[PDB]
Amino acid sequence: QTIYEKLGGENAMKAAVPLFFKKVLADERVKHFFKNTDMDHQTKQQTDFLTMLLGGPNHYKGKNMTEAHKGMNLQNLHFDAIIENLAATLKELGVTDAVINEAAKVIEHTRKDMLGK
Numbered sequence: 200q201t202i203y204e205k206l207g208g209e210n211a212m213k214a215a216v217p218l219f220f221k222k223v224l225a226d227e228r229v230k231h232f233f234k235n236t237d238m239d240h241q242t243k244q245q246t247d248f249l250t251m252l253l254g255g256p257n258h259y260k261g262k263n264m265t266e267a268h269k270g271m272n273l274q275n276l277h278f279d280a281i282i283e284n285l286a287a288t289l290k291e292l293g294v295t296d297a298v299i300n301e302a303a304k305v306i307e308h309t310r311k312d313m314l315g316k
């Protein structure tokens with residue numbers, strides 16, 4: 200069983216990513232980083248990245264997490280906000296706390312790759 204399957208597979212991921220962006224783009228700590236972002240493109244990259252990271256098909260062709268956030272000098276409070284919004288998204292979509300934690304635990308390894316770049 201992969202975390203991707205536990206979350207409900209492809210239709211669940213396609214629902215979760217725009218709901219995660221709806222919470223990110225409402226969060227004072229991080230919404231402004233997206234001011235000039237093409238959000239259709241970013242929906243596709245982020246769906247492909249999370250799907251690959253959580254054990255679904257690997258079709259991610261984007262940048263690595265240092266390149267993706269290069270020159271943003273992101274701080275720990277920004278990464279906490281992204282995790283909090285993904286957790287709130289998956290909870291609103293009916294995922295149990297155990298599965299949200301498994302997913303967060305994988306994503307958390309990316310923190311050192313993108314902070315302070």
Ligand code: HEM
Nearest residue numbers: 229232233236237244245248261262267273277278281306
């Ligand atoms: C730490 C707070 C974070 C902020 C403020 C943030 C913000 C951003 C922004 C502004 C861009 C794109 C610049 C543009 O193309 O318009 C980007 C690219 C990306 N971010 Fe983040 N991100 C953060 C954390 C995360 C996390 C935790 C992940 C994955 C778990 C992630 C995955 C990505 C991916 C896949 C891209 C796309 C790279 C590509 O287009 O090739 N980010 N991010």
